[PDB]
Write a protein that binds this ligand. Structure first.
Ligand code: AGS
Ligand code: AGS
Ligand code: AGS
Ligand code: AGS
Ligand code: ADP
Ligand code: GLU
Ligand code: THR
Ligand code: MG
Ligand code: MG
Ligand code: MG
Ligand code: MG
Lengths: 315, 170, 98, 354, 335, 325
DNA sequence: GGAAGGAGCGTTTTTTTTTTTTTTT
């Protein structure tokens, strides 16, 4: 069978990774130099953290990737016993590598590691840093305990810009010989919201669905991100407009009330235009509505009342 | 590819990045502890990550242990003077005939003997798995027994605890 | 990586045949490798404890069948092979066998 | 000897002396107790609800209901938390206060009571042939303090096992009782005794104890100070008699619960000075009161009604005070920590007064 | 005779068959025809207290299976049982997967014996949302051999997927118009002599709860028997037994509120709460008095309706009766 | 055996051709299986829209009638903790097909009930074994799914069922059974369905049960209202007219009579009146604010019980005060 | 002889269900 495009076109080299140009350039510098230190890679989902770390390890270790890399993630056993035995034995292993090269322990989703295992990793890093180096990958850098953070260079990935997403999408289209239009690519980028995994998934879905990537064809399957709809609903100057948006764009499309209220809270947390008093009052009203929904009254009437109270707060 | 924080590590107490008053307080406390009938048996150091607790402890030991260690009566393990000024507990050590929770209990039962001609400073930085309730209870019991021990001679015991918050985990 | 090799004698290994995946044509010099997770392979230990004879039969679809003969108790164990073998594992296996 | 509250406790229906209509209704209930429904007696605290329940049990069974012993029943939660409850038992009935277990009260309903309901009581007949069966009586003290889960667990236990068990619940207010539970019980209102009846009981006690009384006005004043609570009336009578060499006089002070005087002082301070520092001092007083395990709702009610008695305040101030009291009482009912709500009420009162 | 007279009237007169259930025909007809169609769906009975839900399900099970087969075809769980997520995932799932037990020849000849079991979850609204979610696919997967019956008073407490999976039956309130016949039959069976209109008054006071009405009738009968005068029961005695505030006391409260003096209202309320009247009954009587009064204007009625609603909600939250009553009376006085 | 089943299960779609109201999603998945390029799927939608039916039908189409041998289905009724993900799901996803029948399928129905730890463990299982396995997640609440899992899955939204699809399914059921439905009855059924086919099927089964002679009797809107005990539109209109035009006593009497005629519930009347008022043309916007706030408060109070008469009077007073602005 | 800079202060700790890790077996 044919692999999905997300996995089929996963980059093999750092040069094929787009976005965070300075960070990728630093990674390439490290790869071509060799003296890799303990590092932490943090950022939002689907921006190349796993791809970047794996490509760096591959380029650094060459043929010795199999015997010089130990990869562990949340799907494997990673308790304190694992740190005591498997990681310890790997770090103790005497492996002949080219000068400036070290064994790499990749801990993907390191944030999920237990407190005991994280504390145990301190002594391992202290003892075996001469021949072993650790590459943590996570979404929240603060979820790694401070003693471990103290030894590692931090590297934060930013959300991908529309330009890099468009460039890599054009590369994929050229490889796949996909017919498209500019508006279709713009719609795909808009719906991706900076997540390239979603961008590639939506591109594949659209290409399958109709063959031609148009805006209308893209929007037949992919929907506009609902956080923007919620923001438009909250910022409406008229109660009628807010109610109309809530009905047509959210309720009639099958969005659950709990999702709507959670998204409303998240969006209100980042409303720069509104004042602080109005913002906190809106947060209070949203929380009261959320409490009512959790009790079982997840009705459209409650959301309409929440919108009415928010509009009152605005006035 | 040596890391700078290790490559340029201090080689003497004068280069340790420590406030002068804190260094004086720690040095006086440890020196008093090294007395034959010292009032204090455990020195507990607490603070944030990377504030020179273990570094200053080791640098001070390098001076204090030779000063107070009794000269051997022509007896020693190997030909060399056995430069083991600091004895550290390892939390990842696993032996065949010992349950995990007893490991620390064993360590102290050995550390008790490092006095006089075998004088050494006991340092506890890599603690046992205190997140396990039973292990923490055993650790506390062992600490209390050391504090209340009737042994006339004991070596100075230093416990360095790095204080940090545990991020919420699923 | 460790190895346990059965002797080539008619008291522990009564017979062995490789059929090139069709049960008919015997081929010499070809090696068949089946990758399994021990959590499932070890489930036949209790059956083998009482077994008098064991017959292994692996097909091309990655299915391994173990027939255990202890008038008597007859056991059939069918297991699936893993998706694929890593390059490191293949290299280690080849080095062990050569 | 025993306190006069218990020394002169009536031990029969015919021994009752106030609320004769309630006594007649209880007697009518005991005429044919075979089909006695579950009972829920509600009324002001200290009016004699437990005494009347015991009198009804005595009429149904006999004086042996008053021979009470205490046992300890051990329960284990999901987290292995081991805890204990006191079960007061007589040969004919049982007494429990599940609210003593807080949020774990439901466990008591699910394990203990259910078992009591499931075990049919049978005994060999002394004269006739064959076994004889009798339903067990169970008293639930402080029914209104049960969590909603325990009340829900009570429903099918009451219904299915009606043959083997009859519940008699007692409460001071029915507001916290869920509707399904009220539907399953015969509701009995227990009015407080009038001042005249309290004075008569106190005078009878005085005559029994040979205490010299200058005038009967002292008993009336004690009854007024008790606010209809006969138990408090008797306790203060005993305290005043002992502190006055068993010779009461019109000049003898009336002893009130210490926390009540503390709340009165707090009200006076609140009225006098209104500022942040005054609020902090009031918080200190509130925390001291809570340290003695005084319920937060009781503290709020006492403080509110003490404030409403101040003469200097006007109609608007009192209206605002009662509004805030209602709002913060609801907040306490729906809340987790009482300090927030009491402090908020005091702050709102300070804002309105100033 | 004594054995039969050893039960409270509510349990003594619990309906035995579906024919005895009253005022709930809209669902009883479907349940009855299910005995012939053998096409019972998953059921969600919901309604206010004492409307006949548990009685209906018990009667349906008895009619479907019978005294002997029921013990192997019915699994009942209620609030008194542990119903955590583990219970739902293990015990309920195991019973739902159980093979249908073989009926005996007597059972087949005497009862329809449909080829499935029944799981009854009484007081289902007390179960947690996660535990409810654990039932979703168990109900669908084993619908060929198992049918679920959830019963509740607050339907909003049932998660939406479960409500969608279950056919819904709303039990109506039992009032003087639809439940009078059953109460009259019960009174006749017990030879309870009452004045004309007493049963209607009891039903009106019960406010949709036939269990409360039956208990009130039993209390009145006991009082009359103890008195032993041969006179018929009166509505005044029923009101006194039901905890209804006498009309004169309500009139006094109304005049005090009309006066508008805070101190007099406070003193009167302090004296009134000594009697122990339940605040809910007083609020209901005040609502009936004010809303139906023709001497007040529209604005007053709107404001008082909102005030009464707020006070009733606060009381339902389980608040101090004295404080809430005083606040309501003061607010009405300021209108 | 199908005859004894409830209609909700008796009429479960068996093939993708029987799933209505999801034309775009269905066409996309059908063509994906035709080209054998199925990606990891997420089906997000409200109850009773055809997610489980669609995924089971797709599995049947992919693997014919032996899908149960190469499809691993897990739902909320099963334990799906991190240990389950590590052992069972991982072993199934990392093993070869039974007869090399392309790729294996793992269905996680009601995945919004899974814990955060299990979802986090699922990420690398999904990514590593994409060649041999494909994952399908189904959900009603997206906020319970972690961002990584959402990013890994191609999203498809199951909208509330359109009217035409409901009419076609109802016609299919009516031809299957020997049942007759009136156009007004069908309109009422669609209106009360709220885009849920389960409700339609359950109400239709109850209506058939209600008929004395289903072989010839026709289902009218009155039968539907009786079975559901819901208010008629005329009752709602009369109640609203009395509230907005008559005096307090007349409105109270009208509400009491309308409720006592058929034992209607107050919450149903409130919902109907809210729906009616949502289309009202209001020249003052504060009226809408007051209506929404007060009616939401009354609904919340009703959800916890309370006094019914007081709540009805509250509804009347709230509407009158709101429209007095 | 004024800044500016820095140290020490300002602390204690079960509970509902449900899930998970750890340790000894
Ligand atoms: N910067 C990028 N350039 C090219 N392709 C990318 C990029 N980021 C993501 N992709 C695509 O998305 C796939 C997933 O990338 P990953 O690096 O595994 O995602 P991620 O950043 O690790 O997100 P998390 O933290 O694992 S949820 C890759 O295989 C690529 O196909
Ligand atoms: N001038 C210096 N002063 C102190 N530490 C230094 C210095 N130069 C390098 N280091 C190194 O910096 C590191 C930090 O010192 P540590 O004493 O180990 O930290 P800490 O205070 O003990 O906290 P933890 O528990 O180790 S995270 C050590 O590895 C030192 O060798
Ligand atoms: N419809 C009815 N027909 C006849 N008797 C009824 C009816 N409803 C209630 N009763 C009487 O009230 C008793 C209780 O009935 P139930 O069926 O338990 O009410 P309920 O709906 O279950 O109340 P909840 O919801 O558990 S508080 C019965 O034993 C009957 O005596
Ligand atoms: N699109 C549809 N076409 C035809 N019948 C449908 C459709 N959706 C639902 N149904 C009917 O409703 C029943 C339930 O459908 P499901 O697919 O199980 O509901 P659902 O979408 O999974 O909702 P949840 O998430 O499980 S509550 C099916 O067995 C059908 O009888
Ligand atoms: N009729 C009565 N005659 C004399 N004392 C009474 C009478 N009724 C109640 N009491 C007294 O009131 C006290 C408290 O009554 P109790 O039943 O505990 O109140 P509660 O209703 O709060 O349980 C008892 O100690 C009892 O002596
Ligand atoms: N209260 C409004 C009337 C609202 C309406 O009739 O829509 C005035 O003007
Ligand atoms: C009726 C009147 O109040 C109108 N709604 C304005 O002006
Ligand atoms: Mg990653
Ligand atoms: Mg250190
Ligand atoms: Mg019931
Ligand atoms: Mg489904």
């Amino acid at each position: 069978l044919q692999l999905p495009w997300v996995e089929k076109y996963r980059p093999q080299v750092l040069s094929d990774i787009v976005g965070n140009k300075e960070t990728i350039d630093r990674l390439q510098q490290i790869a071509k130099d060799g003296n890799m230190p303990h590092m932490i890679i943090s950022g939002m989902p689907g921006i190349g953290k796993t791809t970047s770390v794996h490509c760096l390890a591959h380029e650094l270790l060459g043929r010795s990737y199999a015997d010089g890399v130990l990869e562990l993630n949340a799907s494997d056993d990673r308790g304190i016993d694992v740190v005591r035995n498997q990681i310890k034995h790997f770090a103790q292993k005497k492996l002949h590598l080219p000068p400036g090269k070290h064994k790499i322990v990749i801990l993907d989703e390191a944030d999920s590691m237990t407190a005991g295992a994280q504390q145990a990793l301190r002594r391992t890093m202290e003892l075996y840093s001469n021949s072993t180096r650790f590459a943590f990958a996570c979404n929240q850098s603060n979820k790694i305990i401070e003693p471990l953070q103290s030894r590692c260079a931090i590297l934060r990935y930013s959300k991908l810009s529309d330009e890099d997403v468009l460039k890599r999408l054009l590369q994929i289209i050229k490889l796949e010989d996909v017919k498209y239009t500019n508006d279709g690519l713009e719609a795909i980028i808009f719906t991706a919201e900076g997540d390239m995994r979603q961008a590639i998934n939506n591109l594949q879905s659209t290409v399958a669905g109709h063959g031609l990537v148009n805006a209308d064809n893209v929007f037949k399957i992919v929907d506009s991100p609902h956080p923007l709809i919620v923001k438009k609903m909250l910022l409406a100057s008229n109660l009628e407009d807010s109610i109309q948006i809530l009905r047509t764009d959210l309720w009639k499309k099958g969005y659950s009330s709990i999702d709507i209220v959670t998204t409303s809270f998240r969006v209100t947390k980042n409303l720069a235009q509104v004042k602080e008093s109005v913002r906190l009052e809106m947060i209070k009203e949203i929380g009261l509505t959320h409490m009512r929904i959790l009790e079982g009254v997840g009705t459209y009437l409650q959301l309409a009342s929440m919108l009415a109270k928010i509009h009152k707060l605005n006035n | 590819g040596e890391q700078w924080y290790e490559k340029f590590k201090p080689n003497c107490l004068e280069q340790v990045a420590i406030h002068k008053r804190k260094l004086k307080d720690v040095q006086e406390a440890l020196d008093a502890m090294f007395l034959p009938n010292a009032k204090h048996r455990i020195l507990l150091l607490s603070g944030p990550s990377g504030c020179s607790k273990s570094t200053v402890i080791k640098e001070l030991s390098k001076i204090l242990v030779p000063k107070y260690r009794q000269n051997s009566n022509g007896t020693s393990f190997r030909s060399t003077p056995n430069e083991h000024k600091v004895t550290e507990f390892r939390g990842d050590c696993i032996v065949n005939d010992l349950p995990q929770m007893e490991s620390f209990s064993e360590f102290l039962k050995g550390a008790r003997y490092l006095v006089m001609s075998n004088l050494s400073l006991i340092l506890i930085e890599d603690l046992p798995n205190v997140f396990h309730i039973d292990t923490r209870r055993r650790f506390q019991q062992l600490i209390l027994q050391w504090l209340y021990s009737s042994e006339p001679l004991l070596p100075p015991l230093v416990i360095c605890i790095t204080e940090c918050e545990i991020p919420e985990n699923d | 990586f460790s190895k346990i090799k059965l002797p080539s004698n008619r008291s522990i290994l009564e017979k062995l045949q490789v059929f090139d995946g069709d049960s008919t044509t015997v081929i010499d010099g070809f090696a068949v490798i089946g990758f399994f997770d021990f959590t499932s392979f070890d489930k036949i230990r209790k059956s083998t404890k009482i077994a008098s004879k064991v017959l292994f039969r692996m097909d091309v679809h990655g299915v391994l069948s173990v027939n255990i003969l202890s008038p008597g108790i007859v056991i059939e164990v069918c297991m699936l092979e893993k998706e694929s073998i890593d390059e490191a594992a293949q290299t280690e296996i080849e080095l062990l066998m050569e | 000897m025993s306190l006069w509250v218990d020394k002169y406790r009536p031990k029969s229906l015919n021994a009752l002396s106030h609320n004769e209509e309630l006594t007649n209704f209880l007697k009518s209930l005991s005429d044919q107790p075979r089909d006695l429904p579950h009972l829920l007696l509600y009324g002001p605290n200290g009016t004699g609800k437990k005494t009347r329940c015991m009198a009804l049990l005595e009429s149904i069974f006999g004086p042996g209901v008053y021979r009470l012993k205490i046992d300890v029943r051990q329960f284990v939660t999901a987290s292995n938390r081991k805890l204990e409850l006191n079960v007061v038992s007589s040969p004919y009935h049982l007494e429990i206060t599940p609210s003593d277990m807080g949020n774990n009260d439901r466990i008591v309903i699910q394990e203990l009571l259910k078992e009591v309901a499931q075990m049919e009581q049978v005994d060999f007949q002394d004269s006739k042939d064959g076994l004889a069966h009798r339903y067990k009586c169970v008293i639930i003290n402080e029914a209104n303090s049960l969590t909603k889960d325990a009340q829900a667990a009570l429903r099918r236990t009451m219904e299915k096992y009606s043959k083997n068990i009859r519940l008699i619940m007692v409460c001071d207010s029915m507001s916290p009782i869920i509707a399904p539970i009220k539907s399953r019980c015969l509701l009995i209102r227990c009015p407080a005794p009038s001042d005249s009846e309290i004075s008569t009981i106190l005078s009878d006690v005085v005559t029994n104890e040979r205490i010299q009384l200058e005038t009967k006005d002292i008993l009336k004043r004690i009854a007024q100070a008790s606010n209809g609570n006969l138990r408090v009336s008797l306790l203060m009578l005993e305290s005043m008699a002992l502190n006055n060499e068993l010779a009461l006089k019109s000049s003898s002070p009336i002893i009130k619960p210490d926390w009540i005087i503390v709340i009165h002082k707090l009200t006076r301070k609140i009225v006098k000075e209104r500022s942040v520092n005054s609020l902090i001092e009031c918080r200190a007083v509130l925390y001291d009161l809570l340290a003695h395990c005084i319920p937060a709702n009781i503290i709020l009610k006492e403080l509110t009604f003490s404030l409403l008695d101040v003469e200097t305040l006007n109609t608007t101030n009192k209206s605002s005070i009662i509004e805030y009291s209602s709002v913060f009482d609801e907040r306490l009912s729906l809340g987790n920590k009482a300090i927030f709500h009491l402090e908020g009420f005091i702050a709102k009162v300070m804002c309105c007064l100033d | 005779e004594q054995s039969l007279a050893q039960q409270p009237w509510v349990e003594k007169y619990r309906p035995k068959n579906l024919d005895e259930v009253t005022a709930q025909d809209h669902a009883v007809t479907v349940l009855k025809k299910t005995l012939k169609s053998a096409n019972l769906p998953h059921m969600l009975f919901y309604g206010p207290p004492g409307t006949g839900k548990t009685s209906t399900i018990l009667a349906l099970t008895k009619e479907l299976y019978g005294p002997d087969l029921m013990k192997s075809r019915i699994l009942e769980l209620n609030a008194s049982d542990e119903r955590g997520i583990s219970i739902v995932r293990e015990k309920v799932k195991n019973f739902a997967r159980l093979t249908v037990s073989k009926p005996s020849k007597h059972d087949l000849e005497n009862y329809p014996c449909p080829p499935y079991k029944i799981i009854i979850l009484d007081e289902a609204d007390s179960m947690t949302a996660d535990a409810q979610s654990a039932l979703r696919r168990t109900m669908e997967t084993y619908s060929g051999v198992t049918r679920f019956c959830l019963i509740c008073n607050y339907v909003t407490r049932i998660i939406d997927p479960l409500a969608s999976r279950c056919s819904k039956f709303r039990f109506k309130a039992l009032d003087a118009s639809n439940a009078i016949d059953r109460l009259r039959f019960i009174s006749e069976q017990e030879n309870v002599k009452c004045d004309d209109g007493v049963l209607e008054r009891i039903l009106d006071i019960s406010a949709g709860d036939l269990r409360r009405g039956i208990t009130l009738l039993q209390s009145a009968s006991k009082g009359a028997q103890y008195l032993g005068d041969g006179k018929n029961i009166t509505s005044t005695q029923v009101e006194e037994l039901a905890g209804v505030v006498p009309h004169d006391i309500l009139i006094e409260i109304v005049e005090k509120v009309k006066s508008g003096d805070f101190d007099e209202i406070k003193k009167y309320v302090n004296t009134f709460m000594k009697s122990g009247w339940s605040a809910a009954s007083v609020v209901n009587q005040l609502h009936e008095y004010y809303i139906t009064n023709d001497n007040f204007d529209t604005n007053f009625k709107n404001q008082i309706s909102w005030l009464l609603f707020t006070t009733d909600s606060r009381l339902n939250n389980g608040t101090n009766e004295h404080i809430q009553l005083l606040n309501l009376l003061v607010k009405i006085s300021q209108l | 055996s199908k005859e004894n089943l409830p209609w909700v299960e008796k009429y479960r779609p068996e093939t993708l051709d029987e799933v209505y109201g999801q034309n775009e999603v269905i066409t996309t998945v059908r063509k994906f299986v035709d080209e054998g390029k199925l990606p990891h799927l997420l089906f997000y939608g409200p109850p009773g829209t055809g997610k489980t039916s669609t995924i089971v039908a797709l599995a049947r189409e992919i693997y014919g009638k032996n899908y149960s041998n190469m499809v691993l289905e897990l739902n909320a009724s099963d334990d799906r903790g991190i240990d389950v993900v590590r052992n069972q799901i991982k072993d199934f996803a990392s093993t070869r097909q039974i007869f090399s029948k392309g790729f294996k399928l793992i269905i996680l129905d009601e995945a919004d009930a899974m814990t955060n730890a299990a979802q986090n463990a699922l990420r690398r299982v999904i990514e590593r074994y994409t060649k041999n396995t494909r994952f399908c997640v189904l959900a009603n609440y997206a906020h319970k799914l972690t961002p990584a899992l959402l990013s890994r899955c191609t999203r498809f939204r199951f909208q509330p069922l359109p009217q035409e699809a409901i009419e076609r399914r109802i016609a299919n059921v009516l031809v299957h059974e020997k049942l007759k439905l009136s156009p007004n009855a069908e309109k009422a059924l669609i209106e009360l369905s709220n885009g849920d086919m389960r409700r339609v099927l359950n109400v239709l089964q109850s209506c058939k049960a209600t008929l004395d002679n289903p072989d010839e009797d026709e289902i009218s809107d009155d039968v539907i209202y009786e079975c559901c005990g819901a208010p008629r539109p005329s009752d709602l209109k009369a109640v609203l007219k009395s509230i907005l035009e008559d005096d307090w006593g007349t409105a109270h009497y009208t509400l009491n009579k309308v409720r006592s005629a058929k034992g209607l519930a107050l919450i149903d009347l409130i919902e109907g009146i809210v729906k009616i008022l949502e289309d009202y043309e209001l020249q003052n916007e504060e009226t809408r604010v007051h209506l929404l706030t007060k009616l939401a408060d009354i609904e919340y109070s009703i959800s916890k019980g309370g006094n019914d008469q007081i709540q009805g009077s509250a509804v009347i007073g709230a509407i009158k005060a709101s429209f007095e602005n």
